């Protein structure tokens, strides 16, 4: 009767059972459809492909994500994702388990309400609860105090918590995320003559980003170095055996997070955004937030990102203060893990929306602890 946990993010879907250390399903939130005439009718060709199935056939599919910037925009595709998650990936009947789902803070309310309707009416879940990843990331870190900087494929957000109490007026959110860094990289590679256009190519460029990019701890020095040296150049083999050689794009891509102006945003970079979140908090709480800067989410995996963040925050913050970044290797999974913990606490078993309650209260019930 273990609760199901499912982090339906914009990039990957991480799903499994409560009370455990890893998702069992980690396939991408991608639904693809053929973009070409089928001819070999005799093989039983499909209309659509999902997740790993879709990426394995990406060169013939217009791969699309149902979720963009944390918002579900394509509900038919989202039901396909869920359907496969429950029956083909986890092999579990939804009727037999309550389910914990996640969402970004400061999202549209309708996103939560529609997701709830589907779980109760299409999957017949007996109970449901929706959590904010930033909160789950502290449960997963073993603590009740700190700022979680959750930076994924969809959105980047900062949520300070102190002694388990949230400070919602200090939530900062940027719609700058891994998907944009990827788009930026697709454009920057143009300079060296490489041209990635299609969605299959987008996934290739994503793979490149994941293996070659790093965070400069001094952007200008890395630029000066690149301009005078081959030592920063790396090769990568494309799926067709073609070799692509990449230079300073390796650090100019993630630099966007510190300088969003690179993609046209006037918005503050992540170190200033984090800093501002601290500044919006009562002065008495600042010391503890600085000492508990918690990173989570896939884009926090760039080598050097934690080190760059420390350097940047210490340049904004007053001196004579401990500024500490917590960045465990499971940054990709801490949200799922938090879900795994929360759903297993006895203290949480009164937080579930029972289908019976939903059916009498209507959607307003999903906003208990809306935050």
């Amino acid at each position: 009767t273990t609760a199901l946990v499912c982090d339906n993010g914009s990039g990957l879907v991480k799903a499994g059972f409560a009370g455990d250390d890893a998702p069992r399903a980690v396939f991408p939130s991608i639904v693809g459809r053929p973009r070409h005439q089928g001819v070999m009718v005799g093989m039983g060709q499909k209309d659509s492909y999902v997740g790993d199935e879709a990426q394995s056939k990406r060169g013939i599919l217009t791969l699309k994500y149902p979720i963009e910037h944390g918002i579900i925009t394509n509900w038919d595709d989202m039901e396909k994702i869920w359907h496969h998650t429950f029956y083909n990936e986890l092999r579990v009947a939804p009727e037999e388990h309550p389910t914990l789902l996640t969402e970004a803070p400061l999202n549209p309310k309708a996103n939560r309400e529609k997701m709830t309707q589907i779980m109760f009416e299409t999957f017949n879940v007996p109970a449901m609860y929706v959590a904010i990843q930033a909160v789950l990331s502290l449960y997963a870190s073993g603590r009740t105090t700190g700022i979680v900087l959750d930076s994924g494929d969809g959105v980047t957000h900062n949520v300070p918590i102190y002694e388990g109490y949230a400070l919602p007026h200090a939530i900062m959110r940027l719609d700058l995320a891994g998907r944009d860094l990827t788009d930026y990289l697709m454009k920057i590679l143009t300079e060296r003559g490489y041209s990635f256009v299609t969605t299959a190519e987008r996934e290739i460029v994503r793979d490149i980003k994941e293996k070659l990019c790093y965070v400069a701890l001094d952007f200008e020095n890395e630029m000066a170095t690149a301009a005078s040296s081959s030592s920063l150049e790396k090769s990568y083999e494309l799926p067709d055996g073609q070799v692509i050689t990449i230079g300073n794009e390796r650090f100019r891509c993630p630099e966007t997070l510190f300088q969003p102006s690179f993609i046209g945003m006037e918005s503050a970079g992540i170190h200033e955004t984090t800093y501002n979140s601290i500044m919006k908090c009562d002065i008495d709480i600042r010391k503890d937030l600085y000492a508990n800067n918690v990173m989570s989410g896939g884009t926090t995996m760039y080598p050097g990102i934690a080190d760059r963040m420390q350097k940047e925050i210490t340049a904004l913050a007053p001196s004579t203060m401990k500024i500490k970044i917590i960045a465990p290797p499971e940054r990709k999974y801490s949200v799922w893990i938090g879900g795994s913990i929360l759903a297993s606490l006895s203290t949480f078993q009164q937080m579930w929306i029972t289908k019976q309650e939903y059916d009498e209260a209507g959607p307003s019930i999903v906003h208990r602890k809306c935050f």
Binding site: G19, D20, Y139, T144, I337, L345, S346, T347
Partner: peptide, 16 residues
């Protein structure tokens, strides 16, 4: 530090 241990930590916090 692992879910079994994180659960024990949080159950202890809730009870205390």
């Amino acid at each position: 530090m692992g879910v079994a241990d994180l659960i024990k930590k949080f159950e202890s916090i809730s009870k205390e």
